[PDB]
Design a protein around this ligand. Structure first.
Ligand SMILES: Nc1ncnc2c1ncn2[C@@H]1O[C@H](COP(=O)(O)OP(=O)(O)OP(O)(O)=S)[C@@H](O)[C@H]1O
Ligand SMILES: Nc1ncnc2c1ncn2[C@@H]1O[C@H](COP(=O)(O)OP(=O)(O)OP(O)(O)=S)[C@@H](O)[C@H]1O
Lengths: 373, 326, 105, 69, 424
């Protein structure tokens, strides 16, 4: 029963039909349309263009069109080095890849005059690099300039996450210049183009690959906040091993991990009634909305416990251990914040994820914290 | 303090602004503009004659002078002087001062290569040797035959990088040399604060007015105002999930039910119940996670009831209602 | 505070000693045991309580009590019932309740 | 008409009586004819077509007919 | 590898293996698991599929330290050697600079020492070109996230290549880590597996102790009465009271649920009985034994109880004179942070507001060490010394200023316990 679901985990898209119109001159060897391909994240958009060019290169005339990933540069030189790697040649590399005018000499081909288009992968690392109008916008500016006179032009295909980048362009560039205009976006496929690809990615079909309306149910009730349904099939591939482990069932398993302690399991964290007392003690110190030290909390803990004698006053060292019991369940977090007297000195400020509405319910059942409120 | 504000203005998008701006700057006062340009054309032989005396020529005046300098330097002067000395004509090295990315090292590395490398000047390249290397250039040039070999142009000399003081003194030592003619323009009203009697001794500036009331097309690009957030988050909503449009629509209604300030906002509990009422929000976490996406792109605010409020104006939210949400 | 009244005086300590002597006199004993002071303190605290309207063995006993229902109750009427037949007073177990709360049990 | 009757189910999904996004078919019938609105309940096909419009509005689904996911 | 041959020496003069020595040998933290039994499969069945199908996935586990996530994934790969992969422990905190992990990967494919720059070029050249198997553990991921997230994007972008022979296993501190430090673009690549590890429970904390106490609980030793040496003249036994082991469990599962903390509090409590046994008989270093409940009562408290209270009452007089002046200003002004000159102003005043009493023998000594020749000191004797002594002790805290009057002083421990320890 394994080998049917061993193969489970692994032209084709209805977005490739768009881009061949957008590359309408790429089979007639002319300069194509003006390509700035954006997208909200997770939407397949990195592999989307990679699907096109791999279908382009396997289809396509002299054949040399290269694509490089802009991740580890922070600087516009070695991209123009990596276009030279499809030549397998040798030259003086440093000057030719550095200046704007130095790129222009690089664009005279050798063997058969096939035009070249570059593909700039993950442009947002250089967009969201160092300060905008100094280097990175200038880097954006310099690449999109295609004023070259022969039709051999370095057509850009760049990609980005957040859609602020168009308004970042200068008003000269927004005057119908370069690869600007066609701001081709990709709205996140709800279930209406992505699930059908999963259907065709179920070409080798096992018998029980589950009631597919539940798969449709999975698609409809994941599409609130999602972009990657194969990865959201990779959460089906984990639950398909649950039915192997036991020889949207799992989204139900995963949300109760996150929703609880405020409604119900707050009292699970405080089986000690003193842990209930010390939890209200933190919030009474939160009146002075300050750097809530473990000492200022201990200050209000003593000066209240001398008034109402519910228990004896305990140690600060005990007060250290008891607040860590509050910590490991995930209620209150402790951080070493800032005080700048001698050096960067670290006093510990706490923060609570509970509200007084979710407090007042669980304390009226216990009239021993009622003196303390 | 009832003040009319730029937020309370009929705003204009990107393509609408720049096109009708391009209509005015190429059709408003066209006839008198070239009519000025023909009048000042007769001054061009006068500039040629004085510039043989090594005079740093400086152009002030209202309006952009960028087009005028490039006509005067490139087409008129630079072949006229090459013909009058007796072959490629005189090299023109412009300096775009409105471009803030001008440094002192890079432009001078061009200069010593533009000027003659007759000696091993890379030996004196050592750590600031720039004033050192130009001093060895100056005293050699005192005993050379007097002829211009280079004319440089510095547009917008009060620019964001050229007005820095270690760059200004660098240009000061260039101007005392007789072989190079220095034709620059500034635009500031406090431009003669830049020079003392030390530098102007090295400069021997003269002045001329040019006022053509040009729009400064290139010089407007790097500059920005609030035209260039209410407009920022106007584009993110155009690419999201369809549910975020609806949960912002229910957000924007009761936040405009009551400028858009804090007081018109809503509590988190009831808004969870309201977005539970239309079968949208499952609980607090599923609400907040796709509300952090409105938080991450700074599209909504929260202050303290637990009030979440939109920081856009009263007029803006109904514009966000009828256009992008609907 | 709001529900407070008076303070502890040495005359109240002398009255507690006198009530313990009266409790020992009612039992016709020549000595004062530990059972009188724990009754007198309970008497003087329940005299004002109407306005609201030696330990390891006890811990072991509590564990034995737990080995039935597994209940962590705050106030007791049927935990203390297995203690008085053994030999320890009501005051020793009263400390065993508070101490142990530090064990979070 | 349709907004009110589903709005009861909202606060009745706010409670854990359905225990999940799964809910049985008898859980429906104890939440229409048991609850407050009388005689608004349509035919055996019509409010069964009415819950389709909610499924067409993509807020709740129907699956494994003794239950509904 | 090499030098372990040189770490061996010869003369080992018959070390006394006492009763409690053989406990601590197995109470060492080294040597199937009861608590995370089924979740071992949830890793492994997630891992077994990708391994025998030549794919590239991601597995994300979280939890507090001390829960076995360092341990369990080692047990995953360990059995897999029996049944194609290269195991690497890419620890985050064991990298000096964050880019130094890049060097390890390119070292652990062929054996070359190249740039973190030049490594990741050939790494990227590996991960999209090789025709068709690498297991990598990215431990303690708080270290490698800190600078600008450019490292963390790489380690999951390599997973996206369908021609990438790699299997990554991330182990973090918190589940929140790709939601409060990383971007959403990484959070798409992290997936939604998210295998949570909770704490241990106190029943299982009993079930983890006896796994170390398998062949030694209530067993017998062979002992000579002269040297205290035990052998697995009397034939003695040693028993472990399980209720004391239980009360060790019901605290550590309550506060932390940490598997090191449970073992070590048993390990600390074991050696308390060791010295008391050596105290009564003195076998040195060259009828039925047990470990009481009273040992783990002390050693668990020994994790808690302090000494700054005992430190303060064992300090100097002028130290206790200093703090008593300092709380006097904090109840005079209510500003919790007093200027240093005002304290020197106060300790002058706190002399003469008391009567002409011992105080005079103090006030003689407090401004001159006897020696009526040299006198009339402004600030008190060793005032720089005690203020330096209170500074490096951590009790006080004093901001840096060249003015020795208006430099502010802030308390660092709770001022009530300072008030409380002053009373003695
Ligand atoms: N429509 C689709 N057709 C084919 N494969 C798809 C499709 N949608 C998603 N995938 C696959 O699932 C993956 C999920 O996309 P991600 O790579 O996580 O996001 P993305 O491709 O990086 O786009 P970003 O996040 O905007 S950079 C893709 O890379 C593809 O491998
Ligand atoms: N279930 C178990 N069975 C046996 N020994 C265990 C078990 N859990 C933990 N240990 C031991 O206790 C040690 C605790 O280390 P781990 O819990 O694996 O590290 P950890 O949980 O990752 O904490 P870190 O590494 O600081 S994040 C292990 O190295 C084992 O020696």
């Amino acid at each position: 029963k394994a080998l049917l679901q061993k193969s489970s985990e692994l032209a084709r898209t209805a977005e490739y039909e768009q881009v061949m119109n957008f590359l309408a001159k790429a089979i007639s060897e002319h300069r194509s349309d003006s390509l700035y391909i954006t997208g909200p994240p997770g939407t397949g958009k990195t592999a989307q263009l990679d699907m096109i060019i791999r279908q382009k290169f396997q289809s396509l005339e002299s054949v040399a069109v290269t694509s490089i990933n802009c991740i580890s540069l922070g600087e516009p030189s070695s991209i123009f080095q990596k276009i030279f790697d499809s030549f397998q040649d040798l030259n003086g590399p440093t000057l030719q890849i550095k200046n704007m005018q130095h790129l222009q000499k690089f664009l005279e081909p050798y063997h058969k005059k096939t035009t070249f288009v570059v593909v700039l992968d993950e442009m947002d690392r250089l967009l969201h690099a160092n300060t905008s109008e100094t280097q990175s916008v200038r880097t954006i500016l310099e690449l999109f300039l295609l004023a070259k006179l022969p039709t051999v032009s370095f057509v850009l295909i760049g990609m980005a996450n957040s859609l602020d980048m168009k308004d970042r362009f200068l008003s000269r560039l927004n005057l119908d210049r370069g690869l600007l205009p066609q701001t081709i976006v990709f709205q996140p496929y709800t279930a209406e183009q992505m699930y059908e690809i999963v259907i065709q990615k179920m070409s080798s079909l096992p018998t029980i690959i589950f009631q597919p309306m539940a798969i449709k149910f999975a698609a409809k009730k994941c599409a609130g906040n999602t972009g990657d349904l194969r990865k959201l099939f990779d959460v089906l591939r984990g639950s398909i091993e649950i039915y192997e482990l036991e020889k949207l069932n799992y989204i139900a398993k995963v949300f109760s991990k996150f929703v609880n302690n405020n409604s119900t399991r707050t009292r699970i964290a405080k089986l000690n009634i003193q842990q209930k007392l010390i939890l209200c003690t933190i919030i009474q110190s939160l009146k002075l909305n300050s750097d809530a030290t473990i000492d200022e909390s201990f200050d209000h803990y003593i000066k209240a416990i001398t008034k109402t004698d519910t228990l004896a006053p305990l140690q600060r060292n005990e007060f250290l251990e008891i607040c860590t019991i509050l910590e490991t369940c995930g209620l209150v977090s402790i951080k070493k914040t800032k005080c700048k007297g001698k050096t960067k000195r670290f006093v510990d400020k706490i923060d609570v994820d509970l509200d007084m509405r979710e407090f007042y319910d669980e304390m009226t059942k216990i009239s021993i914290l009622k003196p303390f409120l | 303090k009832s003040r009319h504000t730029m937020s309370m203005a009929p705003d204009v998008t990107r393509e609408e602004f720049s096109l009708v701006s391009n209509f005015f700057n190429e059709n408003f006062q066209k006839r008198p503009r070239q009519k000025l340009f023909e009048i000042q054309k007769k001054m061009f032989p006068q500039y040629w004659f004085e510039l043989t005396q090594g005079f740093s020529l400086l152009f002030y005046g209202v309006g952009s002078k960028r087009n005028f300098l490039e006509e005067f330097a490139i087409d008129y002067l630079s072949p006229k002087i090459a013909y009058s000395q007796l072959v490629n004509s005189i090299p023109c090295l412009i300096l775009n001062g409105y471009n803030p990315s001008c440094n002192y090292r890079d432009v001078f590395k061009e200069i010593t290569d533009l000027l003659v490398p007759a000696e091993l000047t890379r030996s004196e390249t050592k750590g600031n040797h720039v004033i050192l290397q130009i001093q060895k250039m100056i005293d050699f040039y005192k005993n050379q035959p007097l002829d211009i070999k280079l004319i440089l142009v510095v547009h917008n000399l009060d620019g964001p990088s050229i007005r820095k003081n270690t760059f200004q003194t660098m240009l000061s030592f260039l101007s005392v040399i007789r072989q190079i003619a220095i034709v620059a323009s500034t635009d500031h009203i406090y431009a003669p604060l830049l020079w003392d009697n030390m530098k102007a001794q090295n400069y021997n500036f003269v002045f001329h007015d040019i006022s053509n009331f040009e729009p400064s097309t290139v010089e407007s690009t790097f500059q920005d105002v609030m035209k260039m957030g209410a407009e920022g988050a106007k584009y993110v909503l155009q690419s999201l999930t369809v549910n975020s449009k609806k949960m912002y629509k229910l957000l924007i209604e009761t936040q405009m039910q009551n400028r858009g300030t804090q007081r018109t906002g809503v509590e988190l509990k009831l808004f969870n119940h309201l977005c539970a009422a239309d079968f949208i929000a499952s609980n607090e976490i599923a609400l907040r996670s796709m509300l952090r996406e409105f938080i991450e792109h700074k599209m909504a605010n929260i202050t303290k009831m637990e009030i979440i409020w939109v920081p856009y104006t009263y007029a803006e939210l109904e514009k966000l209602l009828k256009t992008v949400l609907n | 505070s709001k529900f407070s009244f008076g303070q502890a005086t040495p005359r109240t300590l002398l009255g507690i000693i006198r009530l313990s002597q009266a409790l020992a006199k009612l039992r016709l004993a020549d000595m004062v045991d530990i059972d009188d002071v724990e009754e007198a303190l309970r008497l003087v605290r329940v005299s004002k309580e109407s306005l609201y309207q030696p330990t390891t063995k006890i811990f072991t006993i509590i564990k034995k009590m737990l080995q039935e229902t597994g209940k962590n109750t705050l106030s007791y009427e049927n935990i203390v019932k297995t203690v008085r037949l053994r030999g320890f007073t009501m005051l020793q177990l009263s400390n065993c309740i508070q101490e142990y709360s530090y064990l979070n049990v | 008409r349709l907004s009110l009757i589903s709005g009861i189910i909202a606060r009745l999904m706010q409670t854990e009586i359905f225990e999940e996004e799964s809910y049985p078919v008898a859980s429906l019938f104890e939440r229409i004819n048991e609850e407050l609105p009388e005689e608004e309940k349509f035919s055996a096909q019509e409010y069964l077509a009415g819950l389709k419009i909610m499924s067409d509005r993509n807020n709740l689904m129907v699956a494994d007919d003794k239950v509904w996911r | 590898s090499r030098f372990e041959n040189k770490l061996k020496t010869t003369q080992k003069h018959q070390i006394v293996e006492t009763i409690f020595s053989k406990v601590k040998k197995q109470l060492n933290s080294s040597y199937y698991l009861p608590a995370r039994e089924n979740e071992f499969a949830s890793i492994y069945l997630s891992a077994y599929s990708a391994i025998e199908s030549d794919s590239a996935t991601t597995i994300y586990v979280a939890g507090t330290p001390g829960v076995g996530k360092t341990l369990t994934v080692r047990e995953v790969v360990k059995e897999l050697l029996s049944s194609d992969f290269l195991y690497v422990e890419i620890n985050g905190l064991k990298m000096v600079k964050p880019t130094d992990c890049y060097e390890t990967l390119w070292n652990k494919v062929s054996g070359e020492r190249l740039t973190w720059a030049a490594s990741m070029e050939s790494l990227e050249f590996y991960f999209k070109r090789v025709p068709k198997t690498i297991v990598v553990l990215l431990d303690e991921l708080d270290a490698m996230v800190t600078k600008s997230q450019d490292i963390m994007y790489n380690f999951f972008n390599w997973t996206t290549y369908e021609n990438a022979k790699l299997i990554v296993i991330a182990v973090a501190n918190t589940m929140d880590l790709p939601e409060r430090q990383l971007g959403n673009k990484i959070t798409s690549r992290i997936g939604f597996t998210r295998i949570m590890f909770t704490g241990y429970t106190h029943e299982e904390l009993k079930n983890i102790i006896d796994l170390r106490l398998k062949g030694l609980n209530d067993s017998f030793f062979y002992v000579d009465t002269k040297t205290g040496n035990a052998i697995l003249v009397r034939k003695v036994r040693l028993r472990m009271s399980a209720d004391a082991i239980e009360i060790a469990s019901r605290k550590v599962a309550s506060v932390s649920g940490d598997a090191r903390r449970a073992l070590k509090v048993c390990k600390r409590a074991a050696e308390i009985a060791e010295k008391h046994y050596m105290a009564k008989h003195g076998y040195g270093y060259d009828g039925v034994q047990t470990v009481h409940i009273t040992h783990v009562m002390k050693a668990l408290n020994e994790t808690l109880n302090s000494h700054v209270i005992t430190f303060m009452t064992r300090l100097s007089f002028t130290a206790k004179l200093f703090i008593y002046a300092l709380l006097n200003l904090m109840k005079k002004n209510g500003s919790q942070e007093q200027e240093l000159g005002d304290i020197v102003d106060e300790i002058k005043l706190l002399i003469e507001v008391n009567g002409s009493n011992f105080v005079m023998e103090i006030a003689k000594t407090l401004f001159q060490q006897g020696s009526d020749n040299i006198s009339e000191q402004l600030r008190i004797i060793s005032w720089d010394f005690v203020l330096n002594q209170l500074l490096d002790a951590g009790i006080l805290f004093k901001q840096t200023m060249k003015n020795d009057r208006i430099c502010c002083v802030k308390l660092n421990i709770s001022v009530e316990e300072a008030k409380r320890a002053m009373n003695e």
